[PDB]
Amino acid sequence: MVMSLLGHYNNFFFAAHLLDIAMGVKTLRTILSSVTHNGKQLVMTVGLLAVVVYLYTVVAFNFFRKFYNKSEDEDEPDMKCDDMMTCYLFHMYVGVRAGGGIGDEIEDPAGDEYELYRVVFDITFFFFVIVILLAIIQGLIIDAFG
Amino acid sequence: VKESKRQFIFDVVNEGGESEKMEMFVSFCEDTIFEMQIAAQISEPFWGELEVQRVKFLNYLSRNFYTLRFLALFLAFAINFILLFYKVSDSPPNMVYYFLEESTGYMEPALRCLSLLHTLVAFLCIIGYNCLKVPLVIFKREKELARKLEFDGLYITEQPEDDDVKGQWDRLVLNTPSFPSNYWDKFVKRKVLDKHGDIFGRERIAELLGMDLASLEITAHNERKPDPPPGLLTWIMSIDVKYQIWKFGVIFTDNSFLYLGWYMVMSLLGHYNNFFFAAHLLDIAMGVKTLRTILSSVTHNGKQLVMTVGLLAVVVYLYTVVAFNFFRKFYNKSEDEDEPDMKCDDMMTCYLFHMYVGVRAGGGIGDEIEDPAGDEYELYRVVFDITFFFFVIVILLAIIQGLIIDAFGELRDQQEQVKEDMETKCFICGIGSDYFDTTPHGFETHTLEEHNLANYMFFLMYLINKDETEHTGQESYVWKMYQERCWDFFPAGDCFRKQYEDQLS
Amino acid sequence: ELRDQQEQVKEDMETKCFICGIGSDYFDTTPHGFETHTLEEHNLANYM
Amino acid sequence: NFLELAESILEYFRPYLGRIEIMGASRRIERIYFEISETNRAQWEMPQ
Numbered sequence: 001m002v003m004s005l006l007g008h009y010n011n012f013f014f015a016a017h018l019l020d021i022a023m024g025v026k027t028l029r030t031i032l033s034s035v036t037h038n039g040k041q042l043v044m045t046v047g048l049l050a051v052v053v054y055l056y057t058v059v060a061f062n063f064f065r066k067f068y069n070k071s072e073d074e075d076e077p078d079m080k081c082d083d084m085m086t087c088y089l090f091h092m093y094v095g096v097r098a099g100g101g102i103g104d105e106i107e108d109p110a111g112d113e114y115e116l117y118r119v120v121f122d123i124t125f126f127f128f129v130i131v132i133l134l135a136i137i138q139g140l141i142i143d144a145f146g
Numbered sequence: 147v148k149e150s151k152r153q154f155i156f157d158v159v160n161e162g163g164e165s166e167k168m169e170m171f172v173s174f175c176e177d178t179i180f181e182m183q184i185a186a187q188i189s190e191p192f193w194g195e196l197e198v199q200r201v202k203f204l205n206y207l208s209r210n211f212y213t214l215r216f217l218a219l220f221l222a223f224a225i226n227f228i229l230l231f232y233k234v235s236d237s238p239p240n241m242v243y244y245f246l247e248e249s250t251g252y253m254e255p256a257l258r259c260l261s262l263l264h265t266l267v268a269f270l271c272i273i274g275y276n277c278l279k280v281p282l283v284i285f286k287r288e289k290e291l292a293r294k295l296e297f298d299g300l301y302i303t304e305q306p307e308d309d310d311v312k313g314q315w316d317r318l319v320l321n322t323p324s325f326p327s328n329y330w331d332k333f334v335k336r337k338v339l340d341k342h343g344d345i346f347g348r349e350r351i352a353e354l355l356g357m358d359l360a361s362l363e364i365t366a367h368n369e370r371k372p373d374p375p376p377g378l379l380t381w382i383m384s385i386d387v388k389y390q391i392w393k394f395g396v397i398f399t400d401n402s403f404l405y406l407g408w409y410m411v412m413s414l415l416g417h418y419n420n421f422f423f424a425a426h427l428l429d430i431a432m433g434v435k436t437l438r439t440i441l442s443s444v445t446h447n448g449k450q451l452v453m454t455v456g457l458l459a460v461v462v463y464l465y466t467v468v469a470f471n472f473f474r475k476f477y478n479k480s481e482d483e484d485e486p487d488m489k490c491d492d493m494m495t496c497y498l499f500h501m502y503v504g505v506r507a508g509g510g511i512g513d514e515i516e517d518p519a520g521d522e523y524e525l526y527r528v529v530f531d532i533t534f535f536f537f538v539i540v541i542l543l544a545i546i547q548g549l550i551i552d553a554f555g556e557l558r559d560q561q562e563q564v565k566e567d568m569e570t571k572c573f574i575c576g577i578g579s580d581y582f583d584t585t586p587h588g589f590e591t592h593t594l595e596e597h598n599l600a601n602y603m604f605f606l607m608y609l610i611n612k613d614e615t616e617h618t619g620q621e622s623y624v625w626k627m628y629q630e631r632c633w634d635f636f637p638a639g640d641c642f643r644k645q646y647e648d649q650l651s
Numbered sequence: 652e653l654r655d656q657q658e659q660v661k662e663d664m665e666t667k668c669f670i671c672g673i674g675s676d677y678f679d680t681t682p683h684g685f686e687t688h689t690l691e692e693h694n695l696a697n698y699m
Numbered sequence: 700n701f702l703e704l705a706e707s708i709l710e711y712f713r714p715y716l717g718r719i720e721i722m723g724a725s726r727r728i729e730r731i732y733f734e735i736s737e738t739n740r741a742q743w744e745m746p747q
């Protein structure tokens with residue numbers, strides 16, 4: 001009712017009532033029960049992902065700052081890892097959503113003295129964050145179905 | 147004690163066998179009795195006063211061990227939250243300067259104070275663990291050693307397999323004057339010598355167990371009562387170095403103690419560089435039970451996951467060999483024609499390129515190497531790319547994800563199986579509920595009044611506390627079976643109702 | 652499916668005699684009855 | 700009493716006293732006792 005009243009202040013508040021399908025349709029309720037059955041585990045998995053990404057951010061901020069220049073203009077560099085808050089935001093926002101991890105979005109390390117350290121960094125990020133943790137979420141949903 | 151009981155029940159129902167169920171139950175009862183003694187000891191009520199204060203402090207630490215661990219976790223989180231405000235610059239607040247950028251100006255002193263507090267709390271956690279959990283570890287080790295000495299002749303009739311590091315190390319405590327320090331049986335050496343000695347030689351056994359046969363009879367003959375001062379000189383003189391070395395070996399091979407020691411070491415390194423405190427954020431896995439269970443899904447098939455990664459490496463190496471032998475022209479990753487950058491002109495570089503870029507590419511290596519349209523090897527190369535995509539990207543990664551999902555399912559199945567076993571069958575006699583439920587609430591009454599396992603624990607404690615000359619016939623019978631380690635008195639496939647079915651009907 | 656096959660084999664071996672097919676429940680009416688039956692009475696190694 | 704006096708002999712010959720059960724010609728289950736050779740037992744116990 002409150003959202004319906006707000007809909008007269010701004011008509012776009014009526015979009016909130018489209019969420020009523022979850023409560024209305026029994027099939028949708030059962031489907032969403034698969035997500036909510038292990039909701040606590042899903043939240044804990046997201047927290048674990050945040051912690052792991054923070055650890056990767058610490059490593060990058062301490063050793064791989066040079067590779068986090070996201071500007072094509074040499075006059076105005078745009079460093080995403082010159083401060084820990086910005087580096088953590090960059091990681092959690094871009095690396096997690098990247099198909100191949102942070103390495104997809106940071107500078108190519110070929111020819112650098114830290115080439116092997118940095119390829120290990122990228123590969124471990126890809127395998128832990130992209131492959132395993134997301135697999136954990138999907139497996140939680142599947143196990144809820146079962 | 148309830149948590150310990152739940153863990154023990156899970157273990158027996160899941161991995162334990164039926165033949166050793168009662169032996170494991172009695173071992174759990176012994177461990178529970180020892181832990182109850184420890185809890186009673188640590189329960190809240192110049193040398194003398196110092197000793198009193200030391201005991202009070204250690205008891206407080208043991209009592210609040212878990213609270214201290216939670217405090218350590220909280221301090222680590224606070225330290226890392228502060229570290230999130232760090233910044234790097236070329237000028238002081240070509241060397242680079244790291245410093246906190248906060249408007250309040252209270253974070254940096256707060257960081258110092260929190261780091262010192264975290265190190266202190268880590269040290270206190272180590273002490274609390276040593277005073278609370280180590281005693282049970284030593285108790286179990288000594289108990290197992292005594293049982294193997296007496297009922298197996300481990301160091302008399304047999305020998306350790308030379309790969310059993312536990313046995314090789316336990317050979318160090320046999321002759322020590324304080325071998326049974328935590329284990330209750332203070333006459334293990336006498337028992338071992340009497341059964342083992344005629345066939346192995348009394349003097350040989352006495353030498354293996356560090357026994358003085360001459361004083362052995364005198365001790366029983368009469369009574370000696372010393373009264374040494376508590377001086378540090380006397381205390382130092384009365385220290386069994388060989389036992390202490392064996393005990394410290396056991397402690398330093400204990401996993402939880404090693405984890406706490408690593409925690410303390412990382413806390414100390416945090417003062418050399420504050421960013422080492424980020425390692426303590428990994429303590430959430432050990433702390434939060436939900437996270438531990440979630441990570442158990444990954445670690446359940448950890449060996450299979452590692453083998454799958456190795457298989458992926460081998461397959462990618464095969465693809466690298468094929469590319470290096472036939473498709474080198476397509477691996478130029480430079481847009482400048484003057485300076486080509488070939489990634490497959492040497493096998494090491496080609497393998498690195500494959501494992502690093504092709505595996506992480508959404509569509510495989512073909513996403514990252516030159517387009518083959520119009521080439522003489524166009525079909526060979528499209529087959530190369532498609533097979534790479536289907537084997538490496540689609541199947542092997544699917545294998546990893548399926549391993550994780552199957553781990554989830556298997557763990558859930560284990561929990562459900564334990565619950566079903568407990569709810570459908572008696573833990574002691576093994577008779578199913580169906581039989582007892584012929585009477586209203588028959589299974590409930592049987593498991594709460596007739597065959598309650600807590601009651602068997604209580605009976606063991608009652609027998610231990612009661613004077614032997616006051617034991618009834620059945621109490622003496624069960625006591626003798628306990629002393630001889632015979633578990634036949636436990637009802638197995640039988641009960642009072644089955645025994646007197648006709649009369650009770 | 653493979654895990655289920657392994658678990659089924661284990662359960663079948665632990666709950667029923669390989670030779671006569673009688674379930675453990677019957678033998679366990681005696682203490683360690685199934686163990687004694689499968690190690691002394693109907694041991695398949697003994698038939699070999 | 701005889702079994703107690705023969706305990707040592709019975710323990711010594713335990714690994715060689717093979718025991719099986721069969722459905723005999725009398726239509727009854729019969730227990731059969733025989734000798735298992737040491738070489739046979741060792742070959743059976745070989746890990747392969």
Ligand SMILES: CCCCCCCC/C=C/CCCCCCCC(=O)OC[C@H](COP(=O)(O)OCC[N+](C)(C)C)OC(=O)CCCCCCC/C=C/CCCCCCCC
Pocket residue numbers: 052055056059062063114117118120121124128
């Ligand atoms: C779920 C798990 C999450 C994992 C979290 C992310 C880690 C994954 C990745 C690892 C790959 C990179 C390894 C780090 C290599 C860095 C390059 C390097 O090391 O260059 C040599 C340095 C040069 O020193 P410097 O004097 O020039 O600058 C020091 C002064 N500063 C720092 C203020 C500038 O030498 C040194 O400092 C000595 C090295 C510093 C002490 C060790 C700290 C690095 C630890 C990394 C993680 C360890 C586990 C690895 C396992 C992989 C994941 C399972």
Ligand SMILES: CCCCCCCC/C=C/CCCCCCCC(=O)OC[C@H](COP(=O)(O)OCC[N+](C)(C)C)OC(=O)CCCCCCC/C=C/CCCCCCCC
Pocket residue numbers: 461464465468471472523526527529530533537
């Ligand atoms: C999990 C499984 C992992 C799979 C590993 C990766 C394989 C997947 C891909 C296959 C697609 C490409 C097939 C190879 C075609 C290459 C082009 C070609 O063949 O051009 C004709 C050649 C020209 O010869 P040349 O004298 O000019 O240079 C020879 C002198 N050199 C090599 C030093 C320069 O003729 C010849 O040499 C004769 C050909 C050489 C003998 C056969 C070696 C190629 C074998 C490839 C794998 C076979 C299984 C295929 C199944 C697909 C996956 C299931």
Ligand SMILES: CCCCCCCC/C=C\CCCCCCCC(=O)OC[C@H](COP(=O)(O)OCC[N+](C)(C)C)OC(=O)CCCCCCC/C=C\CCCCCCCC
Pocket residue numbers: 003006009010012013014015016019
């Ligand atoms: C527990 C609450 C969350 C449950 C879902 C409700 C979602 C909306 C949120 C919250 C509670 C009320 C928020 C405060 C509303 C106060 C009004 C307000 O401050 O409104 C400001 C603007 C209106 O602008 P105006 O002044 O020009 O209006 C013209 C009127 N004149 C001309 C007089 C100026 O409002 C707008 O425009 C934007 C309106 C469109 C926003 C989308 C609403 C529904 C669609 C998506 C959001 C759903 C979230 C899903 C999460 C739940 C998952 C289970």
Ligand SMILES: CCCCCCCC/C=C\CCCCCCCC(=O)OC[C@H](COP(=O)(O)OCC[N+](C)(C)C)OC(=O)CCCCCCC/C=C\CCCCCCCC
Pocket residue numbers: 055056058059062412415418419421422423424425428
């Ligand atoms: C079994 C061991 C692995 C378990 C996790 C521990 C991770 C760290 C590793 C290893 C053991 C100790 C490594 C050697 C440390 C010796 C100290 C060192 O050589 O340190 C060098 C630099 C310090 O530089 P500085 O001289 O300018 O300091 C200022 C001090 N003044 C001004 C006096 C120069 O250290 C730095 O800067 C970098 C410090 C930040 C590195 C990140 C640490 C925690 C976050 C992520 C890594 C966690 C890995 C996860 C893998 C476990 C998965 C289960």
Ligand SMILES: Nc1ncnc2c1ncn2[C@@H]1O[C@H](COP(=O)(O)OP(=O)(O)OP(=O)(O)O)[C@@H](O)[C@H]1O
Pocket residue numbers: 148149152568569571572573574590593594597598599600
């Ligand atoms: N011999 C047994 N003794 C006790 N419980 C048994 C026995 N056999 C089966 N059970 C079952 O084990 C479960 C014991 O209940 P439960 O563990 O909840 O008791 P509790 O004393 O309240 O402890 P907790 O709160 O730690 O679970 C019940 O399902 C009971 O039916």
Ligand SMILES: Nc1ncnc2c1ncn2[C@@H]1O[C@H](COP(=O)(O)OP(=O)(O)OP(=O)(O)O)[C@@H](O)[C@H]1O
Pocket residue numbers: 664665667668669670686689690693694695696
């Ligand atoms: N007729 C039978 N003969 C033997 N074992 C049987 C029989 N019926 C069921 N079983 C069960 O099969 C399993 C046999 O045990 P197991 O295979 O471990 O013996 P083993 O001689 O130690 O050999 P291994 O070490 O190769 O496993 C036990 O669970 C036993 O209960």
Ligand SMILES: Cn1c(=O)c2c(ncn2C)n(C)c1=O
Pocket residue numbers: 176179180330610628629
């Ligand atoms: C089995 N058992 C014990 O478990 C025990 C004991 N004294 C203490 N415990 C703990 N005694 C004498 C004992 O026989």
Ligand SMILES: [Ca+2]
Pocket residue numbers: 615616617
């Ligand atoms: Ca009496």
Ligand SMILES: [Zn+2]
Pocket residue numbers: 572573574575576577592597641
């Ligand atoms: Zn019972």
Ligand SMILES: [Zn+2]
Pocket residue numbers: 668669670671672673688693
């Ligand atoms: Zn049988």
